[PDB]
C-alpha cells in the first residue's frame, strides 16, 4: 500500500499506473535489453493444453512438472523439486515485473526532473 498511498494520497503521476506502465520504451533508458527467450514452444504449449493464465514465459517448468507427475502415481508427494523450480522461476519473472515497476517509477522521477528543471528557466 506504500506506492498506492503515494499515488492516491500523493501524486498520481509519481507512481506507475497499473495499466499503461511502462510508459517508456524498454530500449530507452534501460541499457539495450534482449527479448525474453522462450524455453517452451507453441506446439508443446498447446500439446498439454495449459490454461491461458498458466501460459506464461515460465511454463517450461510446469510442463516438465506435469510430465513427471503424470508418470508419478499414486505418489502425489513427489515432483517437489520441479515445483520448487517453477516457484523460483515464477519468483524470477515476478522480480522482472517489479523491476519493470521500479523502472517506470524511477524513469518517472527522471521525467519529473526533466520537466520542472527545464521549466525553471521562466
Amino acid at each position: 500500500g506504500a506506492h498506492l498511498a503515494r499515488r492516491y494520497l500523493g501524486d498520481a503521476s509519481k507512481e506507475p499506473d497499473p495499466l499503461r506502465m511502462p510508459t517508456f520504451p524498454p530500449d530507452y533508458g534501460f541499457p539495450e535489453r534482449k527479448e525474453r527467450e522462450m524455453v517452451a514452444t507453441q506446439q508443446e504449449m498447446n500439446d498439454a493444453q495449459l490454461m491461458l493464465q498458466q501460459r506464461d514465459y515460465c511454463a517450461h517448468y510446469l510442463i516438465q512438472l506435469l510430465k513427471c507427475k503424470r508418470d508419478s502415481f499414486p505418489n502425489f508427494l513427489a515432483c517437489k523439486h520441479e515445483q520448487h523450480d517453477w516457484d523460483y522461476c515464477e519468483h524470477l519473472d515476478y522480480v522482472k515485473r517489479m523491476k519493470e515497476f521500479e523502472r517506470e517509477r524511477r524513469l518517472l522521477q527522471r521525467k519529473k526532473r526533466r520537466e520542472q528543471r527545464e521549466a525553471e528557466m521562466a
Binding site: 517452451a40 514452444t41 508443446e44 510442463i63 506435469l66 503424470r70
Partner: protein, 127 residues
C-alpha cells in the same frame, strides 16, 4: 389466584378420567396382533444362520447381505448401462467424446510410437 373447590371437583374428576384414558392408551400383551404371513424358506435358512450366536456366522450373514447388495445394486448397473453405452451410446457419433490427453514433451504415443521431441535446456536456476 384460586384453585377453588368448585373448580377442583372438575379438575380431579377430569384427572381420573384422563388418567384412565391414558391407561387405556397403553396396549396389551396381544397388542399388536399381526395377521399370519408367509415366510420364504431362504430367510428361514438365513435366520437359522443367525440364531446360532457364532461370531463367524454373524459376520458372514452380514457379508452375504453385502454380497446380495453388490450383485443387485452395484453389479447389475455396470451390466445394463455398460450394455447401453458400448453398444448403443458409443455406437453413435459424438455421444461420447474425450479431450486429447495432455501430451508432454518426452512422451510416447501408443499408435505412432514416436516420443514427443524434447525441449531446449531449462534456465538451470537454483535457489
Amino acid at each position: 389466584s384460586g384453585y377453588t373447590p368448585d373448580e377442583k371437583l372438575r379438575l380431579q374428576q377430569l384427572r381420573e378420567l384422563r388418567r384412565r384414558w391414558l391407561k387405556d392408551q397403553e396396549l396389551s400383551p396381544r397388542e399388536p396382533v399381526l395377521p399370519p404371513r408367509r415366510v420364504w424358506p431362504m430367510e428361514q435358512f438365513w435366520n437359522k444362520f443367525l440364531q446360532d450366536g457364532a461370531p463367524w456366522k454373524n459376520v458372514i450373514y452380514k457379508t452375504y447381505r453385502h454380497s446380495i447388495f453388490a450383485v443387485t445394486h452395484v453389479l447389475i448397473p455396470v451390466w445394463i448401462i455398460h450394455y447401453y453405452l458400448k453398444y448403443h451410446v458409443t455406437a453413435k457419433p459424438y455421444t461420447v467424446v474425450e479431450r486429447k490427453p495432455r501430451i508432454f514433451p518426452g512422451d510416447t504415443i501408443l499408435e505412432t510410437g514416436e516420443v514427443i521431441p524434447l525441449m531446449k535446456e531449462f534456465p538451470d536456476q537454483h535457489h
